[PDB]
Design a protein around this ligand. Structure first.
Ligand SMILES: [K+]
Ligand SMILES: [Mg+2]
Ligand SMILES: [Mg+2]
Ligand SMILES: [Mg+2]
Ligand SMILES: [Mg+2]
Ligand SMILES: [Mg+2]
Ligand SMILES: [Mg+2]
Lengths: 93, 273, 63, 86, 118
RNA sequence: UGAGUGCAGAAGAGGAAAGUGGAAUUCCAUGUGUAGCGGUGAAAUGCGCAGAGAUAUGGAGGAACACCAGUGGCGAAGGCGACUUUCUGGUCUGUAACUGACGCUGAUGUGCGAAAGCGUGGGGAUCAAACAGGAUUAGAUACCCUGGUAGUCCACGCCGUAAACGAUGAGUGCUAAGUGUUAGGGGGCCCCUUAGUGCUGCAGCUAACGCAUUAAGCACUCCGCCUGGGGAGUACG
């Protein structure tokens, strides 16, 4: 089961904790009986509409192969808490 | 959920009660019990100040941690027990240093399940955090209003509160009863609803089943005499006979607010009701 | 007229290719109809899914 | 279910190797299916659209099973004791 | 009493029984409005193109005292008052920097009211 | 050959639990600023100088998901429309490995069944029975207007109805054509063919209207139902 995870990180995080955050989330998606076919990053791109009085934000794709869904569920769960994160979507492909 | 007893007699005719299926041990922990004699509304003066108490089954007090100061350590739920001292069910949590303490058990807490505490904790149910590290919207219980004292604002069954926002040093909380209140962000809380969510759907069926609890009967004012109650007196049944329904000690009771107004929380309270 | 996807041989539309999707949109962010674009129904339905996903992820506007 | 479990079970009930269409094979598959759908329903008990397919599967099973009973009671009795459905 | 704001917005709300034309900053702060009811129009006159012109003129002449030359136009609602109001705004000695016919159209939201039978 | 399985493919608002999002309405608080707003065939009640409405910012909360959208699709029907994940059913095409009539219909029975309604417990923005007021009118316990409780919303139960309509029972087969569309397949943009979905139309049928390869035709099988109108879908059970 090959999934595809993309999320958004608020622009006002410093690069170090931003790298740390992305290591955290890749390690989450991988370290629950999965692997990562690719782990990608675009850049601080523009948004079509504002979030919480943010205008632009980072994007990060994490194309995952897995099964049993636990990793993706925990991703959604923790991304809910993390205010460093704004959006998240998973798409089975 | 609820046991509906069949109607043999007229005392079990409309009764219900609880399955008691959340409950795994009955025999408590001897080490944490304390005595609890009935006082029955009887003051220091010996006098009956508060009515409609007394004459109930005896109880023994299960000593509970509303503080959760044991942080960093992780716990393991052992048993979910009964507490007569309250409406909720409790849990014997075993810390890895080998200590046993009771807590208010939430909705969805299972045996063998882990319970952390502190600021560095996960956000899972049963875990105890301060309202800083608790994010917005999450549903919580057992809030303390003074850091170090212990949880006082969500302790009954099925009860919970909601975190809304932050005013810097303070935190907005949407209590049950609909009343919003700033609370200080060092103060701890737990994630979830308190359990025994069907405690309110219990029809008691009998007068005895209330006397077992310690509830003497309420006599009404329209039957007392004028020496005893201002609603009282009258030839035949009589109505109230006043602009306002009054209490026994001669205060109005219907609609009249009874709150002190130079109190220190009056600014901490954003919305009421 | 003609279908763009059938024309180009592409058979599976991605929720991330705004430089492919933004020409199936009006000025106001609205999804264009099929009589206008000349697409097939299969690919039009794909467009709905991909576009609305892209809008969720802010890759395109609702308006 | 999937082709994996499907093959895994029809291998051991097929009367021979190229057979994949005998009543025994079908009803074994069906029993697997109805058990799966029941375990779905015990959670999502309000999916009547799926209970419908369950009922169709049961009827088709019983029809095959009556036919096999008519044909060879020995295979009937053996299959039902192997599956535990009576 | 004095205010010196050079550029602003004009918000033209028009309906089938009234128009209102208010003149604000580029930050949502009011300087002036006018309304057919302010001018005294009562009935099927408030609906008209005429009262629309007269209200736009009155509010623009109330607002140029605060020193306004350019102004952004912001239309809301249906009704045959908006075009006349805007032409009148050109006649009121003010320059027109943008029209926006934005109208709150929901995404299949709250349930509207029942149908009138007359 | 029919009916079913398998293998390779396709589509899909089919269903169920959770999760995310944006536009709008309402409400609140603050700023600006002042004379009405709203509504009408026309007016008034209502709100408003205690600063409304407009406007900007922000928040709370509930409901429904604009454009795509289509005589389009799916579902046994009822019904299903944002997006996502998890679970899940059924159908179509091609093949011709596989079983070899296993099929059809189906009384009693069982179970699903719009909307309203009921019970419990939550929720509660909009809309809105009843209710109040204004207006209209000979009168108006109506239309129209301002408001507004149940209710609409969620879960677990119950009811078990509808112009629940295609007013057309299910299954199978034969009977001219033409043209659009949906998901497929084979051949060389065109042809041919499956299963659906619309229009026009010959034979035939029909009391006429009209149906006409999605029959209301030709025929067979099974089920239910009608036997003048009212009383009466009443009464007793
Ligand atoms: K219908
Ligand atoms: Mg007496
Ligand atoms: Mg007295
Ligand atoms: Mg008397
Ligand atoms: Mg009296
Ligand atoms: Mg009304
Ligand atoms: Mg056809």
């Amino acid at each position: 089961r090959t999934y595809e995870v993309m999320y958004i990180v608020r622009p006002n995080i410093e690069e170090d904790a931003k790298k740390a955050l992305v290591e955290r989330f890749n390690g989450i998606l991988a370290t629950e009986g999965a692997e990562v076919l690719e782990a990608k990053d675009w850049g601080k791109r523009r948004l079509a509409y504002e979030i919480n009085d943010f205008k632009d934000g980072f994007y990060n794709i994490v194309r995952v192969k897995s099964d049993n869904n636990k990793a993706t569920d925990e991703f959604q769960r923790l991304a809910k808490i993390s205010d460093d994160i704004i959006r998240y979507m998973v798409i089975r492909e | 959920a609820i046991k509906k007893y069949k109607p043999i007699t007229n005392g079990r005719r409309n009764m219900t009660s609880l399955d008691f299926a959340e409950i795994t041990k009955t025999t408590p922990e001897k080490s944490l019990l304390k005595p609890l004699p009935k006082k029955a509304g009887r003051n220091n003066q010996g006098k009956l100040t508060v009515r409609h108490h007394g004459g109930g089954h005896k109880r023994q007090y299960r000593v509970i941690d509303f503080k959760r100061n044991k942080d960093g350590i992780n716990a393991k739920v052992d048993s979910i027990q009964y507490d007569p001292n309250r409406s909720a069910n409790i849990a014997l949590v075993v810390y890895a240093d080998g200590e046993k303490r009771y807590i208010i058990a939430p909705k969805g807490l299972e045996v063998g399940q882990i319970v952390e505490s502190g600021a560095e904790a996960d956000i899972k149910v049963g875990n105890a955090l301060p309202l800083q590290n608790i994010p917005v919207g999450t549903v919580v219980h057992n809030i303390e209003l003074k850091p170090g004292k212990g949880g006082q604002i969500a302790r009954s069954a099925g009860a919970s509160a909601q975190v809304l926002g932050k005013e810097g040093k303070y935190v907005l909380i949407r209590l049950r009863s609909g009343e919003v209140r700033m609370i200080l962000s060092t103060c701890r809380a737990t994630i979830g609803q308190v359990g025994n969510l069907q405690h309110e759907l219990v029809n008691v069926g009998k007068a005895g089943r209330s006397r077992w609890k310690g509830i003497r009967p309420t006599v009404r004012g329209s039957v007392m005499n004028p020496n005893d109650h201002p609603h009282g007196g009258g030839e035949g049944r009589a109505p109230i006979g006043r602009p306002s329904p009054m209490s026994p000690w001669g205060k109005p009771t219907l609609g009249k607010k009874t709150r002190r107004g130079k109190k220190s929380s009056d600014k901490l309270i954003v919305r009421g009701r | 007229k003609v279908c763009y996807f059938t024309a180009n041989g592409i058979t599976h539309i991605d929720y991330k290719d705004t430089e492919l999707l933004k020409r199936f949109i009006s000025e106001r962010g609205k999804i264009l109809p099929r009589r206008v674009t000349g697409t097939s129904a299969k690919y039009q339905r794909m467009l709905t899914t991909a576009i609305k996903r892209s809008r969720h992820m802010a890759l395109l506007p609702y308006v | 279910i999937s082709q994996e479990r499907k093959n895994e079970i029809i291998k051991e009930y097929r009367v021979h190797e190229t057979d994949t269409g005998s009543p025994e094979v079908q009803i074994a598959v069906l029993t697997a299916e109805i058990n799966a759908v029941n375990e779905h329903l015990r959670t999502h008990k309000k999916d009547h659209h799926s209970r419908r397919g369950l009922l169709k599967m049961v009827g088709r099973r019983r029809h095959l099973l009556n036919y096999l009973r008519s044909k060879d009671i020995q295979r009937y009795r053996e299959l039902i004791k192997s599956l535990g459905i009576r | 009493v004095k205010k010196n704001i050079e550029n602003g917005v004009a918000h033209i709300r028009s309906t089938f029984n009234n128009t209102i034309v208010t003149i604000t900053d580029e930050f949502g702060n009011a300087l002036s409005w006018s309304s057919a009811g302010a001018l005294g129009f009562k009935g099927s006159k408030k609906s008209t193109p005429f009262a629309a012109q007269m209200a736009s003129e009155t509010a623009s002449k109330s607002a140029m005292e605060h020193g306004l030359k350019t102004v952004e136009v912001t239309v809301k609602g249906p009704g045959p008052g908006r075009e006349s109001a805007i032409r009148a705004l050109q006649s009121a000695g003010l320059e027109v920097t943008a029209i926006r016919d934005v109208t709150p159209v929901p995404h299949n939201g709250c349930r509207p009211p029942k149908r009138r039978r007359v």
